[PDB]
mmCIF file of C-alpha atoms in Angstrom:
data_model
loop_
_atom_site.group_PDB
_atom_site.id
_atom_site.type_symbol
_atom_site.label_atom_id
_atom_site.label_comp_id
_atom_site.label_asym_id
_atom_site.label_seq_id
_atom_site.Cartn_x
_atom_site.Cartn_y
_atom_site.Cartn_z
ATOM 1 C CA UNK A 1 -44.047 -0.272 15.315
ATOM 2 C CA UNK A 2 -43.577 -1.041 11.341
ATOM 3 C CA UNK A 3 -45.788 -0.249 8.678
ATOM 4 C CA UNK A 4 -45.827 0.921 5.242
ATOM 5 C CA UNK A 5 -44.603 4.738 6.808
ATOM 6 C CA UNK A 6 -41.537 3.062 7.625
ATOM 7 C CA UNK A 7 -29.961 7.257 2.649
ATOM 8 C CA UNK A 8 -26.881 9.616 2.332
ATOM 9 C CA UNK A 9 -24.894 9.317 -1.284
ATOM 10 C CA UNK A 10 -22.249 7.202 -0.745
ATOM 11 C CA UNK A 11 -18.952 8.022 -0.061
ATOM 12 C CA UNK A 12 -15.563 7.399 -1.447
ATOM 13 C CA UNK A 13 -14.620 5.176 1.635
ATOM 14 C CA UNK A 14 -17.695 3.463 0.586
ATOM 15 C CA UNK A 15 -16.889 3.039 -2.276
ATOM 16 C CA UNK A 16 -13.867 0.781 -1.644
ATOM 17 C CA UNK A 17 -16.398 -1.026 1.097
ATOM 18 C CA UNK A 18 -18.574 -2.057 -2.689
ATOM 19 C CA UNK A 19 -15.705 -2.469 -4.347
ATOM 20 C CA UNK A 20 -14.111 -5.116 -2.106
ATOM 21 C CA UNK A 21 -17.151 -6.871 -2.393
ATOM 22 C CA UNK A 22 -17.127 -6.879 -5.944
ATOM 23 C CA UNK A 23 -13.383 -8.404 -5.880
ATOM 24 C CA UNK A 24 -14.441 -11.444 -3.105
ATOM 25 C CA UNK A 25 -12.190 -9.540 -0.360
ATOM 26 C CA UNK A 26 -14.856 -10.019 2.228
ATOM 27 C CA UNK A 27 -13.485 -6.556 4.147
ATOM 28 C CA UNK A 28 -14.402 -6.266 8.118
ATOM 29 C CA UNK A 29 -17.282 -3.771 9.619
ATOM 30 C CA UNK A 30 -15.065 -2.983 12.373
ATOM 31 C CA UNK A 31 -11.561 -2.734 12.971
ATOM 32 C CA UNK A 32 -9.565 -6.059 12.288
ATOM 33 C CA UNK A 33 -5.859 -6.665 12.779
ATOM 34 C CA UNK A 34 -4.620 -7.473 9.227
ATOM 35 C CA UNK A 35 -2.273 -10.541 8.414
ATOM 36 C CA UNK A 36 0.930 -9.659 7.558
ATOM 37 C CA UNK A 37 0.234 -10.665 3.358
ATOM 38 C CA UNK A 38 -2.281 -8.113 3.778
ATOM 39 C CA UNK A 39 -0.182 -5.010 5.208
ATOM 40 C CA UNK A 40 2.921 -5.882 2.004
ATOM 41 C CA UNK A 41 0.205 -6.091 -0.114
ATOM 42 C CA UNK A 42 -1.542 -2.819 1.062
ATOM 43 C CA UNK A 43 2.476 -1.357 1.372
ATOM 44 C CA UNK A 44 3.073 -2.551 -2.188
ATOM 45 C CA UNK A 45 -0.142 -0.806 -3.667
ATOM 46 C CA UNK A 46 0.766 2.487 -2.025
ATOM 47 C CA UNK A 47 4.814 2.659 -2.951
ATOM 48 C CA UNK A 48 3.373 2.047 -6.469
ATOM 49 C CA UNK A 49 0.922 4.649 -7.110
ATOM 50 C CA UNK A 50 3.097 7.192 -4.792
ATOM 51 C CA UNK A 51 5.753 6.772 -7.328
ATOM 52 C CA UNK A 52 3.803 7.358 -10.019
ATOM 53 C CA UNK A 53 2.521 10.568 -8.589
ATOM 54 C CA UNK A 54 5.871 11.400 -7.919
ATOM 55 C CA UNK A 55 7.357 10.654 -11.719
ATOM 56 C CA UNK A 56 4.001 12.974 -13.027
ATOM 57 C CA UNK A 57 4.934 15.822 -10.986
ATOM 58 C CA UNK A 58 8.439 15.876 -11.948
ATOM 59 C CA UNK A 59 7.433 15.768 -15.529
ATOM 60 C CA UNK A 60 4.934 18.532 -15.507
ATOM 61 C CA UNK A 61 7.653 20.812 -13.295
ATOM 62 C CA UNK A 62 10.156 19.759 -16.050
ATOM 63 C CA UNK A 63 7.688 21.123 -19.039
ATOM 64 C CA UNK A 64 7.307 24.491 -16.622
ATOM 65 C CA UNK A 65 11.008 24.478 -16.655
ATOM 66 C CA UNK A 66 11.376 24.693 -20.081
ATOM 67 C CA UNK A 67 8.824 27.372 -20.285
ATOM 68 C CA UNK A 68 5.722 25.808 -20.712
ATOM 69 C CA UNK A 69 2.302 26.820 -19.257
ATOM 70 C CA UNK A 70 0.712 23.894 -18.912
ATOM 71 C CA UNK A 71 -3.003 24.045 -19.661
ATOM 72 C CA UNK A 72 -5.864 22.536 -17.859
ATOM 73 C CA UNK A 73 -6.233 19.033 -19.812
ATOM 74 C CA UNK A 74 -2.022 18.751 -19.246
ATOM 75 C CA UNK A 75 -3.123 17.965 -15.409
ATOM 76 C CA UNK A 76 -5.229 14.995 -16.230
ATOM 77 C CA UNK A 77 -2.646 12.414 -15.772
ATOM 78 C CA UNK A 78 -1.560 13.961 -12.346
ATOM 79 C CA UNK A 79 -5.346 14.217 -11.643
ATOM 80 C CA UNK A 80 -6.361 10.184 -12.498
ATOM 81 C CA UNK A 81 -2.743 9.271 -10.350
ATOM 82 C CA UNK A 82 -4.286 11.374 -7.543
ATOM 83 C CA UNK A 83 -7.377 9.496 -7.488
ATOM 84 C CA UNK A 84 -5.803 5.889 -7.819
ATOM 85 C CA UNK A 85 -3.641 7.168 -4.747
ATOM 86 C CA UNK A 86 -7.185 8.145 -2.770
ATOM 87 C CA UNK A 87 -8.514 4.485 -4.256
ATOM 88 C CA UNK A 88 -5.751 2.893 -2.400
ATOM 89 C CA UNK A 89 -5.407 4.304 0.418
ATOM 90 C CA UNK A 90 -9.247 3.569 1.101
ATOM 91 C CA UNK A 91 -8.167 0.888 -0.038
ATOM 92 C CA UNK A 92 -6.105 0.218 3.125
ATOM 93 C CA UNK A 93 -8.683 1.374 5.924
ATOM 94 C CA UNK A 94 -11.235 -0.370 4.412
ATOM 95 C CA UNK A 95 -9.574 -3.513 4.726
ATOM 96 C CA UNK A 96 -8.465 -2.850 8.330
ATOM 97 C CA UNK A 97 -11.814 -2.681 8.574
ATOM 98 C CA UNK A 98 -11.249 1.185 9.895
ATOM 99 C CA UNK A 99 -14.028 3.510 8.497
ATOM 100 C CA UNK A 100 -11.385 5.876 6.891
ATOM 101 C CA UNK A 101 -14.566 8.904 6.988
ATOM 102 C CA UNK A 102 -14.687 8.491 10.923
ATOM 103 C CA UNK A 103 -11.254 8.910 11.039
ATOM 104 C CA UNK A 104 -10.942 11.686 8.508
ATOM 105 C CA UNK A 105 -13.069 13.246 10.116
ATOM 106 C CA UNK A 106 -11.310 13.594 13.508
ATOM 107 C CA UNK A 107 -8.046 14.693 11.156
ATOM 108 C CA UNK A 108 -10.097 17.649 9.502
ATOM 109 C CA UNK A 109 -10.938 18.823 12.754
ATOM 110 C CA UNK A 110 -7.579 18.780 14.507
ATOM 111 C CA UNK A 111 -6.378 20.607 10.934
ATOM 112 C CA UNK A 112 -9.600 23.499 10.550
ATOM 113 C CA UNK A 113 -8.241 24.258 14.482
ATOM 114 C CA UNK A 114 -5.119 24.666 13.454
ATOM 115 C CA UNK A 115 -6.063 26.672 10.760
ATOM 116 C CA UNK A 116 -7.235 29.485 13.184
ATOM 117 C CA UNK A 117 -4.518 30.194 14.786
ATOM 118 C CA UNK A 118 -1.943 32.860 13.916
ATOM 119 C CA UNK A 119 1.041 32.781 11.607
ATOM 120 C CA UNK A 120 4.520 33.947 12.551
ATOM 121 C CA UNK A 121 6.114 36.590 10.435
ATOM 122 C CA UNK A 122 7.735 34.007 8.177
ATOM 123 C CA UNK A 123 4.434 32.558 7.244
ATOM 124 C CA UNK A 124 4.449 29.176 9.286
ATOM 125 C CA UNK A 125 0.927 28.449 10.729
ATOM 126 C CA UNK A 126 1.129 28.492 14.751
ATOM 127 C CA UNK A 127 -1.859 26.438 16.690
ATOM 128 C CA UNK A 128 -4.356 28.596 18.556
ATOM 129 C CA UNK A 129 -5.087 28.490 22.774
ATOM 130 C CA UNK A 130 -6.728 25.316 23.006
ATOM 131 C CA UNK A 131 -6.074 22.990 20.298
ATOM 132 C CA UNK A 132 -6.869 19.271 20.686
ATOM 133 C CA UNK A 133 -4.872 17.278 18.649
ATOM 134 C CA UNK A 134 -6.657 14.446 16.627
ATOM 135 C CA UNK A 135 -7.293 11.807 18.799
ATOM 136 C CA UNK A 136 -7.125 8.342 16.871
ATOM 137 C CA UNK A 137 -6.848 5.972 19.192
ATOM 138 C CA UNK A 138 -9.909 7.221 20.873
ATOM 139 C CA UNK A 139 -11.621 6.916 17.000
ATOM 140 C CA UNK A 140 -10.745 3.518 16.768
ATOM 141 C CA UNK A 141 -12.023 2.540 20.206
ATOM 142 C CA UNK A 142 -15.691 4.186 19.506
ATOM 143 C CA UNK A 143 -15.247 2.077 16.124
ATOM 144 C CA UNK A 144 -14.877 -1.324 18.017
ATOM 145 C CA UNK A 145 -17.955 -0.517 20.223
ATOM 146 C CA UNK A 146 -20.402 0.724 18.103
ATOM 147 C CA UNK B 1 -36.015 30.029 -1.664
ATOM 148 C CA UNK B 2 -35.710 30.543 2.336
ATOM 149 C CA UNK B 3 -37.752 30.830 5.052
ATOM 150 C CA UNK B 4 -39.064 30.713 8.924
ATOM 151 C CA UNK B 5 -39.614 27.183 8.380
ATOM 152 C CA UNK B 6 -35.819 26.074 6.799
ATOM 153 C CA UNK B 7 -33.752 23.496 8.369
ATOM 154 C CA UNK B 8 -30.588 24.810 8.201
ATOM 155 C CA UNK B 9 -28.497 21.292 8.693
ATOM 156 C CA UNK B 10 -27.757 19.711 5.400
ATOM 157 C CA UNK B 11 -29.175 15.785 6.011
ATOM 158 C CA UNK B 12 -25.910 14.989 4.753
ATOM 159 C CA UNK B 13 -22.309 15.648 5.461
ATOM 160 C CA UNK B 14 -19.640 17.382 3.601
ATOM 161 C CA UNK B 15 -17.544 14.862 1.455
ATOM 162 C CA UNK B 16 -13.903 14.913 2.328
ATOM 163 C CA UNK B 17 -12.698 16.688 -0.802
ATOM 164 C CA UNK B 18 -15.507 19.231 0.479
ATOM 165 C CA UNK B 19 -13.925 19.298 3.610
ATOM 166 C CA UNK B 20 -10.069 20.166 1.647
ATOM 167 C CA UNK B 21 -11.945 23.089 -0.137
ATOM 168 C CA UNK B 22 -13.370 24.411 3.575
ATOM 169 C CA UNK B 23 -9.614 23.677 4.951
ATOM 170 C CA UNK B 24 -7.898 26.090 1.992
ATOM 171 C CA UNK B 25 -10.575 28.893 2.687
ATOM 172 C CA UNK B 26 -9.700 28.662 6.745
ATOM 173 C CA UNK B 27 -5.618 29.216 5.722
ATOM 174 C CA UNK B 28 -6.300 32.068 3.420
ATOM 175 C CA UNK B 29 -5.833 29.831 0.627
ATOM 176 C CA UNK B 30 -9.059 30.101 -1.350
ATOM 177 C CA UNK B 31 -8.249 27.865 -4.239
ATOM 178 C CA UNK B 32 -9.671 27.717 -7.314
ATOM 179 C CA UNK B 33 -13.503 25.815 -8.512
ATOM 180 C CA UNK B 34 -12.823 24.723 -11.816
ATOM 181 C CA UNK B 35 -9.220 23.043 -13.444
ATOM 182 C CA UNK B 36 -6.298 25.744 -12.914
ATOM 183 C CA UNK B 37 -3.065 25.117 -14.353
ATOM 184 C CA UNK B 38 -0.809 25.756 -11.412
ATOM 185 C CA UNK B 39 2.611 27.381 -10.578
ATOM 186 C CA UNK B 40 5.524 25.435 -10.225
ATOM 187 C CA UNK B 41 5.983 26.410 -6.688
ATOM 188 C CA UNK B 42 2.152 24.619 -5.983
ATOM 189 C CA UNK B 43 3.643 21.300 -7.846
ATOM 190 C CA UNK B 44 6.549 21.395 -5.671
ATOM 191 C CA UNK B 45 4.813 21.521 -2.108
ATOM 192 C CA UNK B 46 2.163 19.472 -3.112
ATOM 193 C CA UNK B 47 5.063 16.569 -4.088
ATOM 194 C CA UNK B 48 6.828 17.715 -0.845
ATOM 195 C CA UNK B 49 3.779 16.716 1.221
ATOM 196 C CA UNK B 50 3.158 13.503 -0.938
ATOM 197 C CA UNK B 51 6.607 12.186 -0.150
ATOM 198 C CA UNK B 52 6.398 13.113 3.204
ATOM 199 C CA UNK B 53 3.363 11.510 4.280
ATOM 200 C CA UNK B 54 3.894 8.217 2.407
ATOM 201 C CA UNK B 55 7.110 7.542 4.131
ATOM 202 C CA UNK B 56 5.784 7.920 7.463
ATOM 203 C CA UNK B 57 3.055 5.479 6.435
ATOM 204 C CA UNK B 58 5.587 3.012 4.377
ATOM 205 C CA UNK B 59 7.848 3.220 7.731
ATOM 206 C CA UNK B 60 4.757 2.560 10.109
ATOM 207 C CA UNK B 61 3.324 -0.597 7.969
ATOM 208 C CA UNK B 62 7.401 -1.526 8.671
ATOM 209 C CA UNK B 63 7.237 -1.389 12.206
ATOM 210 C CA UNK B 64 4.193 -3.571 12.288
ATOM 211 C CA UNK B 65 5.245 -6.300 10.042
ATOM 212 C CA UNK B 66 8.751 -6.242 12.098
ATOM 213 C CA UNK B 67 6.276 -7.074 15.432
ATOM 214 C CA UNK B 68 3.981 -9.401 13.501
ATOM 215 C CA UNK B 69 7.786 -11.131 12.557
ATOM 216 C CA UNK B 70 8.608 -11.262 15.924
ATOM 217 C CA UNK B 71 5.599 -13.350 16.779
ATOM 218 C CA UNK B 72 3.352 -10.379 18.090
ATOM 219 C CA UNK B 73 -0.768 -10.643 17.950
ATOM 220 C CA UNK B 74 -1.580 -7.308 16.780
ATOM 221 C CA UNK B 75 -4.474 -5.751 18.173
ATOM 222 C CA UNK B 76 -6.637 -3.082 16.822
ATOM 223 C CA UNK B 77 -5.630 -0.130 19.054
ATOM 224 C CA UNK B 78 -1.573 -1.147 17.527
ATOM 225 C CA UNK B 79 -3.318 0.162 13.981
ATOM 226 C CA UNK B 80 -4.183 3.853 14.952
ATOM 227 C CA UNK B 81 -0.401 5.640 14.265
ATOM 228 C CA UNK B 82 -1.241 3.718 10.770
ATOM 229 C CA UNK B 83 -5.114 4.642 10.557
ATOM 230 C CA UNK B 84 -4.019 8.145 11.136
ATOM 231 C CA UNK B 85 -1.110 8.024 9.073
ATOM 232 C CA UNK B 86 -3.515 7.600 5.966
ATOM 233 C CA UNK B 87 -5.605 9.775 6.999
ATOM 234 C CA UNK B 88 -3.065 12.205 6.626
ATOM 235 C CA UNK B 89 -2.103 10.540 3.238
ATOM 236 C CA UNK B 90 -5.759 11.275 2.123
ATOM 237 C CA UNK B 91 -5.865 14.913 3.501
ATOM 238 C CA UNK B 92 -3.165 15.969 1.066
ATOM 239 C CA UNK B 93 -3.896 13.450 -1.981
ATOM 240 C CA UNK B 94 -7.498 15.306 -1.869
ATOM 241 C CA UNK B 95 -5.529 18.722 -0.789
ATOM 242 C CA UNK B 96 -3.575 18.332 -4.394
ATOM 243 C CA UNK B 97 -6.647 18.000 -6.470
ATOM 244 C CA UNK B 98 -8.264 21.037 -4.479
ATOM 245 C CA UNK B 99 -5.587 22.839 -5.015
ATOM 246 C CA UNK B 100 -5.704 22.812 -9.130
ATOM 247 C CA UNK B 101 -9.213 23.564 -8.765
ATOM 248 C CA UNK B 102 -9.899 19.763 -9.787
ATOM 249 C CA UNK B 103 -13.048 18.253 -8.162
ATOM 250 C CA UNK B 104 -11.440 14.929 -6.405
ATOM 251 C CA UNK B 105 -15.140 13.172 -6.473
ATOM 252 C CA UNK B 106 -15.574 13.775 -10.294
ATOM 253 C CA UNK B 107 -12.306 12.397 -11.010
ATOM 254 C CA UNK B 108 -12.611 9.164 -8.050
ATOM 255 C CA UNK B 109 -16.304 8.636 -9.500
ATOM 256 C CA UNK B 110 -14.963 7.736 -13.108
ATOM 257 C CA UNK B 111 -11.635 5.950 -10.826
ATOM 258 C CA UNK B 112 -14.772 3.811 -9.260
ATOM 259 C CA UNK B 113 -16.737 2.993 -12.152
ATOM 260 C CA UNK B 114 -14.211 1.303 -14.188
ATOM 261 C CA UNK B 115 -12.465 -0.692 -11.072
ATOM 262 C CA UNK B 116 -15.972 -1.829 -10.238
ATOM 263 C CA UNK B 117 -16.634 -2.469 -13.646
ATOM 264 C CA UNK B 118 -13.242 -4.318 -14.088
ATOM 265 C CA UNK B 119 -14.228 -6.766 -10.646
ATOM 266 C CA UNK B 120 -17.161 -7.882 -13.033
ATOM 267 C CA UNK B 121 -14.838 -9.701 -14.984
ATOM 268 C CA UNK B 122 -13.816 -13.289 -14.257
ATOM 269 C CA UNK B 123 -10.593 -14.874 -12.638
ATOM 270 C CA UNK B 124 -7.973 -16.499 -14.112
ATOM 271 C CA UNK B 125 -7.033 -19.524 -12.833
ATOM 272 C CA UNK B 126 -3.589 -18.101 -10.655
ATOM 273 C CA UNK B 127 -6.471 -15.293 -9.458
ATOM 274 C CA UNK B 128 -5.561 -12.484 -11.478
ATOM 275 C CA UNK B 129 -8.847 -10.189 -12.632
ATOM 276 C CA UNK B 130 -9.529 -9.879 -15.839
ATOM 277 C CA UNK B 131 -11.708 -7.108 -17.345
ATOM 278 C CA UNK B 132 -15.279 -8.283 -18.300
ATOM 279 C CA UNK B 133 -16.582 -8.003 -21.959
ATOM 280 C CA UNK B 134 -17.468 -4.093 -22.731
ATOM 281 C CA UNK B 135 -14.814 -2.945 -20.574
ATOM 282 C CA UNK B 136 -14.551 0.796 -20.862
ATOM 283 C CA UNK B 137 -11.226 2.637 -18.918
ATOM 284 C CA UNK B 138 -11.330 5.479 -16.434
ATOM 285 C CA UNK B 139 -11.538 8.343 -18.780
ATOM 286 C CA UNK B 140 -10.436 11.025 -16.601
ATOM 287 C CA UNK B 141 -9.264 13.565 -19.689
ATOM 288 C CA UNK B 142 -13.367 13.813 -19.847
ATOM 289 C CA UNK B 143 -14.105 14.540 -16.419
ATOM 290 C CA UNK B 144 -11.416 17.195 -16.640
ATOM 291 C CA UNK B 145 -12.813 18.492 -19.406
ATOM 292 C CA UNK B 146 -16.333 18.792 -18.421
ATOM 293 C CA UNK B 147 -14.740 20.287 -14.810
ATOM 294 C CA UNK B 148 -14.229 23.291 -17.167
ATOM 295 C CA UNK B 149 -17.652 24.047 -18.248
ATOM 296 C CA UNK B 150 -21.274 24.742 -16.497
#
């Protein structure tokens, strides 16, 4: 039975799951539909960081138009934007209560298939025989059930 | 190292910026393990991609807010175009930092600490955070930095 016989890292998904905690936003095990404060709120978040990526991009292409190579510690900026982009679109699942790794994980596969198949002359990727598409709404189904 | 005896399954799965770098080898794309300044063509499809896959998410969250308006109980099947939608939106978010060689968990790790560190703090009276005392920001110029070396 039990006795004194008887723990993955976390990830970054989990790591919104703590840090809604830590705010008092109480976010759902399983998936929840959101109230409609929540989805502008989530919409807001993700127009605002986008654009920010957006703006860093065009500034580091304008400095590589003027004829700068830009050196490693230049990409920082881009790189912290990129990660508060990641931290809200967790953000998001998590408080959909949609474990963003299951679902993630269903995208990667549909994509590494993909990824085998051929490309045509002009360098577009073509899908192999066989490809399954990433199936989602089967994801979220084995989500609510488990 | 090795032997008869090895169990060859990790007891843990690859992260999801893992799973980017596995993604680049499998289109030929082998990208870089430490910080590489890239070309300007790299910054232009990565922004490309960006743009793309936010609006199709911005347009979905839309279309659900235009039902919820209309006096419709979502249910949690009406959140998978969405739930796959940012999915996407993290598949090339992490496929940008792969791409300049930049570890996306180093970089989210630091992201993490201070956002966790800054929920520590206490509330205003309207609700808005405020940063605890010994509040130190994300210093993500360090990470990079470090990225570069052994």
């Amino acid at each position: 039975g039990i006795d004194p016989f008887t723990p993955c890292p976390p990830t970054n998904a989990e790591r919104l799951h703590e840090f809604h905690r830590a705010i008092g936003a109480a976010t759902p095990e399983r998936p929840t539909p959101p109230p409609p404060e929540l989805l502008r709120l989530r919409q807001t978040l993700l127009d605002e960081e986008s654009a920010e990526v957006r703006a860093e991009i065009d500034h580091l292409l304008a400095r590589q138009a003027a004829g700068e190579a830009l050196s490693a510690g230049d990409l920082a900026p881009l790189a912290h934007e990129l990660a508060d982009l990641l931290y809200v679109t967790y953000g998001a699942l998590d408080q959909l209560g949609i474990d963003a790794d299951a679902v993630f994980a269903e995208v990667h596969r549909a994509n590494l298939s993909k990824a085998s198949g051929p490309r045509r002359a002009d360098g577009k990727q073509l899908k192999p025989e066989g490809w399954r598409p990433a199936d989602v709404r089967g994801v979220i189904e084995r989500l609510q059930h488990a």
